[PDB]
Amino acid sequence: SWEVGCGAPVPLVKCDENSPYRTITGDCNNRRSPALGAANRALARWLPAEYEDGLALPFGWTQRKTRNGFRVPLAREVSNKIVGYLDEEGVLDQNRSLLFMQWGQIVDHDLDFAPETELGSNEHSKTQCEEYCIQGDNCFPIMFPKNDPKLKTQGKCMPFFRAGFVCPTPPYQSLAREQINAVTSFLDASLVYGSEPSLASRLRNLSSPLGLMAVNQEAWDHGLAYLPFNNKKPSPCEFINTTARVPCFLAGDSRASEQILLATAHTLLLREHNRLARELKKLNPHWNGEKLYQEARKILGAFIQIITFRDYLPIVLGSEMQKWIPPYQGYNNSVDPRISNVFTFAFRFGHMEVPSTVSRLDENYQPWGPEAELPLHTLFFNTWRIIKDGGIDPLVRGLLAKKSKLMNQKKMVTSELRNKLFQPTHKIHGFDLAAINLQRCRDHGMPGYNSWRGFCGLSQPKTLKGLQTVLKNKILAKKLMDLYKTPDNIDIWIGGNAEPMVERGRVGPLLACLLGRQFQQIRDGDRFWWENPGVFTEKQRDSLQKMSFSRLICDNTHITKVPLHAFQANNYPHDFVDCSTVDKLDLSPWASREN
Ligand code: HEM
Ligand SMILES: *[C@@H]1O[C@H](CO)[C@@H](O[C@@H]2O[C@H](CO)[C@@H](O)[C@H](O)[C@H]2NC(C)=O)[C@H](O)[C@H]1NC(C)=O
Ligand SMILES: *[C@@H]1O[C@H](CO)[C@@H](O)[C@H](O)[C@H]1NC(C)=O
Ligand SMILES: *[C@@H]1O[C@H](CO)[C@@H](O)[C@H](O)[C@H]1NC(C)=O
Ligand SMILES: *[C@@H]1O[C@H](CO)[C@@H](O)[C@H](O)[C@H]1NC(C)=O
Ligand SMILES: [Ca+2]
Numbered sequence: 255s256w257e258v259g260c261g262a263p264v265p266l267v268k269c270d271e272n273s274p275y276r277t278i279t280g281d282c283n284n285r286r287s288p289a290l291g292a293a294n295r296a297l298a299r300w301l302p303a304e305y306e307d308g309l310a311l312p313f314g315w316t317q318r319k320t321r322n323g324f325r326v327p328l329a330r331e332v333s334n335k336i337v338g339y340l341d342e343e344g345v346l347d348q349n350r351s352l353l354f355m356q357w358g359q360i361v362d363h364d365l366d367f368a369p370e371t372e373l374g375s376n377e378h379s380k381t382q383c384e385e386y387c388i389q390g391d392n393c394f395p396i397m398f399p400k401n402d403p404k405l406k407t408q409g410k411c412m413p414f415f416r417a418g419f420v421c422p423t424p425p426y427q428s429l430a431r432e433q434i435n436a437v438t439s440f441l442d443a444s445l446v447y448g449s450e451p452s453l454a455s456r457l458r459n460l461s462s463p464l465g466l467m468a469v470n471q472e473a474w475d476h477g478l479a480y481l482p483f484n485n486k487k488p489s490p491c492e493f494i495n496t497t498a499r500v501p502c503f504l505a506g507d508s509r510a511s512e513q514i515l516l517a518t519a520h521t522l523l524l525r526e527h528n529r530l531a532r533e534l535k536k537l538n539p540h541w542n543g544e545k546l547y548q549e550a551r552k553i554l555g556a557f558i559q560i561i562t563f564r565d566y567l568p569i570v571l572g573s574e575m576q577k578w579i580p581p582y583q584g585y586n587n588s589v590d591p592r593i594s595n596v597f598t599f600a601f602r603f604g605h606m607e608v609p610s611t612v613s614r615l616d617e618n619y620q621p622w623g624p625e626a627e628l629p630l631h632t633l634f635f636n637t638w639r640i641i642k643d644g645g646i647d648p649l650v651r652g653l654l655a656k657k658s659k660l661m662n663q664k665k666m667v668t669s670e671l672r673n674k675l676f677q678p679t680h681k682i683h684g685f686d687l688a689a690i691n692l693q694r695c696r697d698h699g700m701p702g703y704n705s706w707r708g709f710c711g712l713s714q715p716k717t718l719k720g721l722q723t724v725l726k727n728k729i730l731a732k733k734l735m736d737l738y739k740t741p742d743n744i745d746i747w748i749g750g751n752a753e754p755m756v757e758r759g760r761v762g763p764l765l766a767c768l769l770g771r772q773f774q775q776i777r778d779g780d781r782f783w784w785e786n787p788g789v790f791t792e793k794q795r796d797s798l799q800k801m802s803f804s805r806l807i808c809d810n811t812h813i814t815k816v817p818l819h820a821f822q823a824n825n826y827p828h829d830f831v832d833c834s835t836v837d838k839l840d841l842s843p844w845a846s847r848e849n
Contacts, residue, residue, distance in 0.1 A: 257428065260421045261296075263420075264289070264293075267288075269285075276782050278451055279294075279449060280440050283780065283781050290591055293444075293450065295420065297432065298593065301709060303698075308430070309428075310425075310426065312699070313696050314326040315389070321742075328398075329688075330396050331737065333667075333672060335733055335737065336752075337748070338666070338667070338672050342609075342668065346659060346660060347607070349822055350657060350660070352609065352652060352658050353654060353803065358601070361441070361566065362604065363437070365437065365438075365597075365601075366593045366598045367437045368418065368435060369436050370392075371392045371419075373392055373423075374415065374679075387409065392415050393416075394414050395412065396413075396686065404673070412684070412686060412690075417434070419433050419434060420434055430699060431699060433697075435592075435598075437507065440780050441776055442558070443506070443555045445523075446467075446527065449506070453506065457482075458543075468504075469528070475647070476647070478525060478810065478812075480641065481503035481504060481520060483504060491511050494636060500637045505520050505524075511635055512634065514640060517636075518649045518653070519653075521646050522807070526806055526810055531547065537841060537842075540846075555784070556801075557806070560799065563777065564799075565802075565821055569760070569821060570760050570769065572758035573757045573759065578766065578767065579770055579773055585778070585781055587779070589779035594772060595698050595699070596768055598698075599691065603761050607661060608630065608668060610659075611627050611630060612630055612649070613656050614627075615651040619826035623644075630671070650807055654817060654820060655824065655825065661761075663754070667687060672686050695745040703744035703746060703749030704744075712764060715741050718731055721735060750762065784798060797842070797843050800837045804820050814833045815827065
């Protein structure tokens, strides 16, 4: 009997079996198991969770508890010795735009979010973790290795709180601890609309029956809309410049303001919505707010899906694309659509594609102002640079005309993220995304590198020399062996990202397999997948397949020169062309005459 009949949530809902629209929660997608791929349920386990005590405590928690007979190395030490680098010269991806990085993050945010356990409010224990670096309960601090410069300027640790888990909040116990996915597993634009009822209605333009999203009432971008602002005081976007006092945005997803390009992308998405909704009203004046909201939402859902599957995944997965994600063959209700706990680490390959600077560029795609280029760390939680420093258009052109960082075995994660990350409530630009990722693999009970190699039908190196051969890199294998002792102990995030990239792709074979399999399932196990006979008409679909990111820019900003292929590295003006040469979204097939 599954000791299923956990957990006390999620406020179970009931389905309208002939509803033509998705729920907000993702309930009801799968008819026979309606909670599948819904938000606020456990991330799926492709392999059993691996905890120090079998149930909940992470490897590394108890100093004298080994993993396979070896101590697991400090996350920050792995980070310092392997992940970091000094010289940003030469690190850029010659064939991927910055938008490639950015769309990766957007997709990730559509799919998964394992928020921290919520116990630190109404209490200092959260501030005591930071202050005293005392491991316990949900405080699992990232301690500095001796020799860390941060030890000299920053104290003993970086604070880190364990992720939320189902059943959920109070600690224990019986089966293994299962982390929660706070968003819908479907690729459904949940980051624009929200994955909870509360949030989803708050976001909409209810006053007006046009079914627009709520827009900003204090700022505009050459008349084009901005996201609404967020109420929650204290605001990290306020905190990073108290003079400017500009708060974070309010999106479907709580992380929308984390970095300025994410907030930028979110802005394009909310606008396409209204562009569609109003366009729909024009062509169907009879439809109330709802019908327009849902029809706009649904097209946008399709937009995310299409760009992701037609434009993005092929240039991540490369040669392995075919093998894991073959041409669509319809909805299959036996396929598990849930995001796996491992995927949420495999998709953090993006972290190695983030470059050290962001640019604002002008209509000639030239530096915009005298500080056109800024270090990435000054743009974390930064809304004021958008509203008071030229709106989104200069940033969007940066997205097209600048390049992603290329992953590099000797230059993995820029120090902007590896030393200068900001976390709300923690005041400093002093955190380490890489170390966090490693501690979080352990927090989540991740099987090690070789377990996952084995899952994917790949060899499992057991010696330094075997690891050299798999990684095609002597020195990197030697560093990982020195720290981890056995490849069986290499944390998945670093193991997966250390593999050389597959031909025509940007991740290695292990991640290709973890990624590919997840993406296959989110497409095949989705009853509302755009191409699934019945979701859209044949004519809508010849039209949906017209859509493009170049197009979404052209229709939602004052940029009129775009590339046809927005994810490749494009230089102005040679690889740019005017907006009128880029196919439009022909909405004719949405015309409804109910005469
Ligand atoms: C400036 C760029 C970025 C910043 C500042 C950023 C920051 C972060 C932070 C703070 C977390 C939470 C880490 C934790 O506590 O475990 C995170 C998680 C994550 N990052 Fe990023 N990241 C960026 C880019 C990207 C990109 C480009 C991708 C993918 C292509 C990505 C994928 C993810 C995923 C999947 C998670 C886990 C989400 C979840 O299930 O909770 N990130 N990132
Ligand atoms: C805080 O934001 C303020 C407000 O925009 C920034 O100051 C602006 O920057 C330059 C020179 O200081 C001027 O062109 C603006 O008009 C300034 N405005 C004001 C009111 O001073 C300031 O640089 C930001 N500070 C940080 C640390 O990010
Ligand atoms: C809702 O729509 C009306 C009419 O277009 C507009 O004036 C109003 O500002 C909108 N409200 C918000 C918060 O978006
Ligand atoms: C649905 O997926 C399951 C498990 O992967 C498989 O057994 C089944 O054949 C698939 N259905 C169709 C119609 O292909
Ligand atoms: C750049 O990548 C695209 C796919 O993004 C590919 O078709 C093209 O051949 C590549 N360009 C170069 C110059 O290698
Ligand atoms: Ca989603």
